[model samples]
Target chain A: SGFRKMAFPSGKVEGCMVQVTCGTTTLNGLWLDDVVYCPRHVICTSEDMLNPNYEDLLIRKSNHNFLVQAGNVQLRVIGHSMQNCVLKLKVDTANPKTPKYKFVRIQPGQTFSVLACYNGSPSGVYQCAMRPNFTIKGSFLNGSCGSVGFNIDYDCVSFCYMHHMELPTGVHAGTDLEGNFYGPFVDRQTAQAAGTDTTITVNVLAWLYAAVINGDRWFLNRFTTTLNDFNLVAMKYNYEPLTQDHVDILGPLSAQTGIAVLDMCASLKELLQNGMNGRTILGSALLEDEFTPFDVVRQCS
Target chain B: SGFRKMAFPSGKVEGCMVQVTCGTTTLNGLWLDDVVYCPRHVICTSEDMLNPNYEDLLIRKSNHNFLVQAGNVQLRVIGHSMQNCVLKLKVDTANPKTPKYKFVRIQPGQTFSVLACYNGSPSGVYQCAMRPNFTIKGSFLNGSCGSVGFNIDYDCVSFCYMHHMELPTGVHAGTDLEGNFYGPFVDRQTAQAAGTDTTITVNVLAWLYAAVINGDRWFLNRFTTTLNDFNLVAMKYNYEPLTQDHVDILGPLSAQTGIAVLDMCASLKELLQNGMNGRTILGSALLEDEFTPFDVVRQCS
Candidate 1:
């Protein structure tokens, strides 16, 4: 017999044999192990299915929405990552030069918020991406790295990565963004009674921060005393005893006062969150303790 | 006896002859017309004796003496007039390039001080003067007016006009000239307990001033509360009832906050002098209140 079929038990076989041929070479009837081989098949593992060059795009939102009003889009950029990345938004059917470019540098693991603005109404599809590796040569982010695609729809503009940088924590006294100087205080009582709690908080924080940065020990001491007074007022008005959180936070800060900007920020945040009871009372306290620092950092940084 | 010195005795003596001098010429017996005539000697009235070109040179002394300590002649120039004057000091017998020439501008009617230094020991005669006209071009006092002589003895250098300026009522916070941070305050109780009543007053004033300047209602409220607390503390410890003078001054000031710097200064000065009970307390308070501003203006300016 020229060929004979190899017989094996019919259950499951461990190995099989087959003839292999290449161009002008052939091998046949070789003693084959019972192993099965799939030549053209890809045996994909879990690792192979993962993206090798993947990186997380962390984004923080200061506000929930970027409502386009009066043909203007305003939002906050609040996020950080390894790269000093900037936000890039591409809107379809819009003039290329319509939206002003913005660059924001976020420090990793730090909480910061920056107000951002884009001119133009929502029109067509929007694709968002990040322009990483920005250089602050002149007028923040004068140059940047090529953009990396992180596309999203126009409706999701609020969720898109819009870059913004933090403002300075210290501002000169007696002037607003529009350079309005409001003053001539008679006493603490009158001043407290004059403005809203939020106004009080912002002013207090600004003064305190300025005093702290300027190394005004005299003012720092005074500010602390005043803060204590505020607590008493809160207790009287809000009918809730003030917490020692502010004292606890400010005590060390005052003693070790200097450019402890971040420390001041954190303590201020804490004060706002748990300083007192009552929204109205807390509003002033919160602004002084928290919003002041937040807005200061935004405007001043 | 040369002319028999005769006087006709009537209701008034007649022919009281006196020699007179005209321009490079002698005139004899210019007739007296029944009026009291001072011949060659002109009689001066009080108004006539008063210098029309006179200005009071106010020299603010930072220290008792301008003692050349450690080869540095540090002193203050204190004065004010209608003119925006700059102080100038010159020392004879000192190295030409030894002292760096500094110009300090003093505003009219405003109190100011400057720390002036000349590189030399106590060997030479120090001649100080004021260069009245100074222009702030590229920087402070880029150019100067010709120096006007206001001579003083080298040993009496305290009499020299040293220039100083007022610091901003609201100073930025942080390290002072001495590099002191000066805080991490505890509760008002602890802070009050830790410092003196004078310390409390100063701190309270500082905080109040800061609040007023920055338009910080929160701090203003707190400051008032703290001031009340301080008043209680003062009453508790010093056994003196708090006066309404501070309140009165502060009330008006609070009503008109910004640029009330001068008002605050005056009130603080008054408080230090007449606010408290004990002399020791008053003395410390005065130093802190008055001297702090003085020194700060000097150093910062």
Candidate 2:
């Protein structure tokens, strides 16, 4: 009655999907907002606490990256440590210099409120959880508590870019008079023709469509089949031979994300580079209980 | 042996296509730079000059919209008016009130050099010819010289957005787990489902493809036909409920073009609002002397 498996995204859309357990027992959820919940204990390290490798465990760095629904989110991280191990939470990985401000006592029954994550109410939100990625450090262990684990209350949902991001796939090529900036890059004739043509037709939404539904999983091993030809339509825009126009498109998202949103546009670019991963960012059985459907992963509307 | 037909695009990709002749003689071109040329005499108005309709002809409003190939463009507009009819070229429609600087002598045999269009060498360049829409007023006429006429040397090419801009088309709706932002907008279930999901997957290039190749010409009449199914895929982004994210995207290109390039974001928003227009911005029999191929419309690399 105390533990449940972690589910993420549609069980379909590509996104952050992971589960934590104290051995075989699934860590129970506190059920913050009905089925809308996070794990009873968000474990910082992947290491086993039951058996300690004390030397390598202390002062060990650990990271947890995630996204939440937009608006005010208050996270109360309660340490479940059995000993007075020196502990600290780097809630803002974006600014790690003042380690002391992020530090707290390593004793049991201690709690810290992190008013992390930002932005207004969008259907989905990505921010500091300490948003983006959070860092936690635990050392001076009494060997029993080899890692730091905290119980949290959050409304987690999936955003596509966080899960699977890559260039589009399964696209077949034809007369590129349509929106084909990509055609110019692949076919010699298209490329040659594009050199002299001024107006380039771009399909922003369709490429996004390609990333969400057009799964690349099948293309991985069946390289010699009819499926191989589909690779011809994979639109690749080269950053090396960058131009003012290319920069024009990517620039806005970069500035908006870097200065304000703070994801470093790396995620945006990563998606630009790889949108063909499809809706299922991480799926298909890392374990029996890990695959959560996209429907359930949705926390707030 | 000098007069020739005016060509616009691949005669396929949509764009500016028009021609002029002093009656049936097909005005001779000075052959600016090979087939790379403008109408040796880009007549300002749509009025016929062989006869006179003095009342409606003079002080008549006229506009010429166009795009030029990138790099240094030198255009010489020499008025061949037989009589002293008032002649003036409003070279900057962007800044209208300064009529004094743009005014030139109305008499015959006078030439004015306007260094209009700006921006560096891309495959295609757009600027003032008097870029965008050029206005010339030859009103206050002495009857015989019905409208203003000119001789010029210039090279022009096509850029896709300049030709056709709109939402996507011919797209099939499926599970929408891929980059289907449009999916959520159209289908009730998809929209309901999308409200809860974060991490939107956007395919910028594909939507552009839709506008280039997926012509709306067919959908114009076949509202109740199977051909109408293709209309479902148009990826329309709504501006009425403008979001910060939308502004983030449309923002960069807005300033890049408006302040630096001088065509307001109106051109860009028009496209975001429309990528389904397909490549043919304007085509088909405007006349026998029109319909240039996209290859010939291209002047520089």
Candidate 3:
């Protein structure tokens, strides 16, 4: 059979069903234009050009960036040594054909911005990628290491800025909401429409439930792919206690090694467990081994 | 050598060398006037009270309410559970014939209330005492507890409002003069006196030195006691980090459990430990165990 690796406008096309090696292990730096591919195609076309044969073309290359609108969205980028970073945000909602994004660079040591909105041209879910050309200190190490890329969908949501208070994490401490101050996690549209705290609460709980257990690891990956992402979630979200339903839905499938949904649930419980009243604090006393989980649960209770 | 116990205006006043049996366990809930006696009156009489005879005073019992004060004195009480407290702040510095004092009661949970005062009377170290009673409720069980009677000597000193931040025990967070916030062990007073945005650094090293190694369980108690006293020296004094001299002088005696001076030092460290920081946001990172001691120490460097 004939063998070829081709690049079209859509994505990437490979020759066979077997394995195809892309790049070398020590591929320190690579250009945005060129992608590694197995020896297959005699001709590689520019991604700018439209492909006539969309069906059989192997390695389709896509240059277009989509726009994502996520209401009450939290954006966090993390990896080895990714500290201060400037992320370009754009929204294509009004003009899906033409892209428009305002870029903001985050300083070093700043973790994640919560309930922030960024608009890209297309209003749908966009395939956003992080290109780390500039160097910044990663959270822990000195030298440059691998970086992880992910996407965020931005939309408007109703949130409350609760009073500032002391939030002790384990022996570690930080400021957090006194309680579930902001949500019923309602969409801005619904919140604006409902005009009640109860509606907002129901919506928020719904969003949280979806965020916690809805999809496979891909959804969870956005929050756990890097230490920066981990810390970002740790700082931002006003997490609710994991109901038995949470365990039932997300326990098995999401119970992978690092990015398990159950682990996140436990962490949520830990962070919110302190300063809580009654049996809630004591019930999680055994979970005190994971300080944040016990504290968060305790505090909320 | 017949022993007896009597209620005194000050505290238990046993003779220096009187052979009397000490109370085995603490009289935990004993009321302010509740008396524990030996039932024998070998040396008990008005004649023994005349010239400070020690034998008749086997152990005079009272709460920490008896007080004596001198010039430029002020007394204030602040704490989490201070709301459930009744304070009898007394100052008896003036009368040579019969020293008298005024008392005031405070309701639970109020913060930053002045308790008592003394018009310029004398230049001696005025003795003051704090008797705290509290009720703890968790998991359906509720009970009350009272502190052992403790005393603090006050002197002419400049003072300010109490530092109200809740800090972890056995750690110090503070900022320095450079406007850079530092230290998880930084105390509130040090931060305020130094002005805003100063370089705040805590002496976690010193606190651990005092608590774990020196066994200063009562350090925080003494610190608060000094703050509560309405004496001139207590007013003028601002806290300073422990110097080599302080450690050298207080170290050996502290190891010996019964030394009065050592007990006082330990109590001070203990009380202030609760005010050390970690109640606010950004507090968690300072206290998180994941950060190695070496990492925290490096911040000082």
Candidate 4:
């Protein structure tokens, strides 16, 4: 079957493999709310961990209170098995109002690693992201774990990456990778404008282009990184030469941003092909042709 | 004095500690230019790793062809000491036109860790970075070691962060952490419009506010992250209630950016005094009395 029930070593709490089944699984002290959830599979999400409003999408009847009668098994995603890996879910609710998380799932036979976070308790549970199997080296997280002091070494996952930005379903009122908080931005222009946040808009607009996005969905990516991994940057791509005009425009932008500005459209192309290598897993394949390619840098007319 | 000598077991290779002295060192086949350099400290920087344009900043006479006669003894820095450590130097010339590489230095009583990378040969030098002393935690690198296949677990140096951007000294023509490259931007608009890249300016300006930046320098930061690490985000700031206007401006922006826009101004304040924590080592202490603070949101009038 597609299910496997696992128990916590602490014994008080057990887990239901939900995607398959786990009926009377123990829940020492988790999921008390009526909200029954699964790690976001597919493209939808809500962040109201306490009271996520997914009226239609949620199988309301599974609310047996604590980890009780969650069938479809996949519904009450409790733990991971050797076949199925694990990852954390939205502490908030699944709403377009929140940041969209691209859930990376791994099937057995697919080479990946496991990252377990023992937050001072065997009952603490482990967390993991499916990584590509290209190294004798494994993925390691120090303080990168959600909790404190959960440091150890594991294989598969390598480095962590910042979330890719998308228009509309992204997040509001939070900080960037470097602890800077933006906001009080409480408005949307017209109806379709992507956002009101201006960190890059006000500061890095000159350096941005509509690198790549699918359909009406587009992302704001910077110009460069020092990463030498061809898996991430992708090696096949031609470099464009700079004219005196391109130089003057390109020069200071680099100084103001911490990353460098390399080829104009190489990265989106990487996303276009799934990297052929994996980061947290080939990042869902980014496909275009569903929309027009954009480069917000120059006049198009 | 404050120096030591060590040779690569490869036998034909050797190194020097110019911060002290390393004369008659074997160069194997590196540094064949007429320039002398030490990693950057204090606040000045340049990117000329090879044939860098730093004529004045370099000690011209020390260029004895390949890895030879670099005195001051503290001159041609070839390796590290039990007292001194080793790090790679700018592979480019010193000019304000590139991303600034913060050459973190480690001192004995300062409480830090080290990270090393072994490319392939005994001749291949190991790379290291300075990390803070909060736990048994040390910085570790995977593909981050600049060379390929140099993966091995070691102490010190944890995750990697993009170079903190500075004004007029960053890089051009590179990719972001995800690999999207931008430009061909051939103009800078007035004399001080930053750059012509507009990934954010065109799509995200509504949500950006002036976060923390030092001196005449400023950086563009996004809104939110899933990061639960308080040492990085800092935990002292109070959350401000959102106004209707802030919501309207912030909502759409978050959706467009992939990252959630959070807290109005908690992050920049993080730089107000350092995380009081450590990231790549407390990030060289930020101070604001040197300039006026500005929030690119709302009307200051």
Candidate 5:
């Protein structure tokens, strides 16, 4: 004997299969096919469960269903099936020690879905886990089904899954998100630390650059008018280095104005590529005056 | 002269100067100390006027004056400056571009100030020119007095003088006037045409790596949750490539969540460098994924 790990409930039951059921499956208030069975260990994602994007991640909290269209959804544990299994679903939208979610007693050959009613008002990676209640210490193979292996002592079935996920189409398609569009922006910390005069100056400069590249004086005028509407000096420019102030004040302005900038940059880049008599490209190198807090803080510290 | 072939008003002024003033001297409204001058060759930036970062290029938009603390203020202008000198002052925050504003003529050594009014908004960037209303074209000279510039037409003026104008401390700074925070998101054409998804995915994956390496479960959870919330399907699983449908749905989400994700990434980088420890340091990666369509839509695209 090669000391083969046990694949069944007993040593005599070699190459045996297990079938169990756990929880109830319902969609639009109706229960459908919800039985799950398998040779064991094979992880399966529910087809009907709603998958989240980045925006959703920021808003869900625990005990919140974060409902999705669970359309005819059914999941089966395949490969190394187990009796009396425990399921754990963790949610660490922002990274934490304890699993954001955990559960026990998942039955095989049953149609069911975990009761995940948590709100993840944060953003980050999340994981899901399911494992047999008992530990077998070694790789467990269930006949023609796949094999289950563990790297740590915490024995249980697990599958990495995402929740509240939101990715740009370019990213989803395995393409790069456009960087040339908004490369020059001050982070919150740097923007916050900047004096009011400095903050306003940078914003206006960015706005102008945005305008020039895009030829949208209207956006520039809007920001200018809005600024004119208020008393600039009386307001307390909080001396927090790089805070939301930059994004709040400058981010939107840049967005509105940056559109024009993007067009300009694109046009310029295209011209340069085609050896045409177009305008010059806008590069970070060209923006020698545009210094971010990262640059300053790095130097000062 | 090296046959100065530069355009006359193309932001090039040869020793040409303009003086600006209001109704009378010693007025109660905000006074003009300097002018905002932009040259044709030098890109004009309104960013500072909005979010003032001293690092950017800017010139004073007002001239100096004395406040009576609490009394009627009169404004006046003096100096054998240029003939087309214009004055732009607001009475208690009035219109900036209309002719209704009180204007003053400048003779040699003539001074300008407020005439009679309650507290008023200070002067903004104004243009002075002779009918040949000729404005000057030239680079701004630092520390020189009585010569300021605005983003003006090249060759609009025959001859213009450049001087460094000192701006008031309490002038209006930039603020996010539009209220939207999410996007100036990249258009679908751009995103789809991106040569590679490496940049975008690298951005997302880098954040994930940071969460793992830094033990920032929050970052992990929140990032993942955002993806989930948007119902972002896996690249490997989705049957079709990114389309307009994907763009409309994911564009805004990406903008909002992407900014937040980048913020967290930057914060984590800072925390790590500062040698921060424990949950605060570790939990730096996690976040709350709660924002609105406005938040996502306005900034991303």
Candidate 6:
């Protein structure tokens, strides 16, 4: 008999299962007629399934110091450790003479929210930063901050960044704003690898399909402009041409969206990859929406 | 009697209302009710109203060779002049080793459509070029070709560029895709002059308003990225920091989209105006869906 039951002295070892082998015999699922029990030749201990005390230190050493979320005229935070921290909220208001900042303390393991308001009234938009142990030298929490505007009633006026490392109960990860679910991804690395390797093409195609169905000129224009801009930067930085990738990605998307979007995407990819900037400029030509990749090239060159 | 009657030999001089002046007296609406009509002193002739035959050449000198429309899976063209021209449609396909081109003759004043298809079936996308007098020496029509894809049934799959030189019928000029009408006054030169003089701020605010209302992430990201890239370029090119303009433009957009997008736009505007290779790297990092503008200042510097 090479199978045995296991027990833990300090902690209950529930849902514990194991197997044993001796000579040329291996045993698992060995059972008695009614009890369904294993042979008692081997013993199980807590050391086999539980981590030692030192593991906590290792986890603490690697754990991120703070968790931040920028959402709807409000900044949300959670102090990850038992350390005092200060959150700085900077509001870049319309009046340059009077930019504003709000500072608040974040206690360990505690969640807090800060309204993007000034003098007890709703303000426009603001950026946030967090520093641990009240040190001003710490990096911006999350490396970047979330932004949101407040309505007259101090509610979120528009969409803002929502950070959730893990999905909340009853909700799935990678669901878009419209509720389209994608992937039961194993982890972030897996999702990212897929995104870089093949999903970019898929995502681009999906956007094109949506734009076509909706007759969304704004989306189409932005897509072409971005593609063009990326190409200009790529070439200026000595990157390879984007023509091959364009053709490959556009083939299927064209079938779905039609030859028009396909042609526009292809043309945009080709134009940018080939270094034609002014042609893809969007919005009012008399007044540029913003300085574009084309302007960058012109300045640099 | 200073009043005069005008006549044309070929075409009647209709819709003509006139006044006469002599010495210290002027006459208009000099009621005769239907006709007491004057002028034995002066007889108006065709010489006052007719062009002297040299104007046609002036018009021909300024007229474009062709008009083009990028539409669903088709490139429509009109030969504006009597000169025989060639229309070339180039297809940038997946197979780089074998790109394709379609050619057709465009007769004077004749309108034509080039279907984005290969053999008997629909093809994905294609770019187009036009040359005068059967000469292949001319550049691509519009310099940037329109793109279009065809479905299995040879139908247009998606949206393509629709060029309305001065706004189409029923659509007011300066109206956005959302039907928000903007302008009523002037021409491109006037708008440009105003934009350069004191209206850049106005235009930027308007666009930000549109993007915020539309909740257009693509545009918001691109605007910020381009702004940052431009600022880098600007600084490199000896331009000052865009402090005042940045506050003016970023304040509202930041509240709606967040501080990250604002920072990116600010950085881009500074870089572009300052002089960095017009590139803003984006994609991947703390945020997904929202394209974060990566500062490439180090790369350029």
Clashes of each: 52, 77, 115, 111, 217, 51
Q: Tell me the docking grade of candidate 1.
A: incorrect
Best model number under TM-score: 6
TM-score-wise, the better of 4 and 6 is: 6
DockQ (CA atoms), all models: 0.01, 0.01, 0.01, 0.01, 0.01, 0.01
Q: Is the docking of candidate 5 incorrect, acceptable, medium or high quality?
A: incorrect
**Ten residues in sequence with the least summed lDDT for candidate 1 chain B:** B1-10
TM-score between model 5 and native:
0.16
Q: Candidate 1 lDDT, tens digit per residue, B125-190?
A: 111111111111010110111101111122111111221111122111111111121222111111
Alpha-carbon deviation at B38 in model 3, angstroms: 65
TM-score of chain A of each: 0.21, 0.16, 0.17, 0.17, 0.17, 0.21
Is 1 or 5 the stronger prediction by lDDT? 1
Report the error of model 6 at residue B155, Å. Answer: 46
Residue-wise C-alpha lDDT for candidate 6, range A1-301, written one tens digit per residue: 0000100010000011112222222222111111111211111123411322323432443213211111212222211121111012122212121112222222111111111211112111111111111111111111011111111111112111111112222121221111122233321212221221111222233333433433434333433444555556545643333455545644554555555434455543553355433322221111111111211121112
Q: Which stretches of candidate 6 lie over 4 Å from their true place?
A: A1-172, A175-181, A184-195, A199-301, B1-274, B278-301
Residue B50 error, candidate 4, Å: 30
TM-score of each: 0.18, 0.16, 0.18, 0.18, 0.16, 0.21
Q: Write the per-residue lDDT of candidate 1 for residues A172-207, one digit (tens) a residue.
A: 011111112122211111112122112233234443
Q: Per-residue lDDT for A117-211 in model 2, tens only?
A: 10211011111111001111111111111111221222222111111001122111111111122232221112122122111111121112222
True contacts kept of 3: 0.00
TM-score, predicted candidate 4 vs. hidden true structure: 0.18
Worst lDDT window (10 residues) for model 1 chain A? Answer: A1-10
lDDT of 2 at B204: 22
Q: After superposition, how far is residue A117 of candidate 2 from its true place, in Å?
A: 53
* Model 5 spans with C-alpha error above 4 angstroms: A1-207, A211-234, A237-301, B1-199, B212-215, B219-232, B236-301
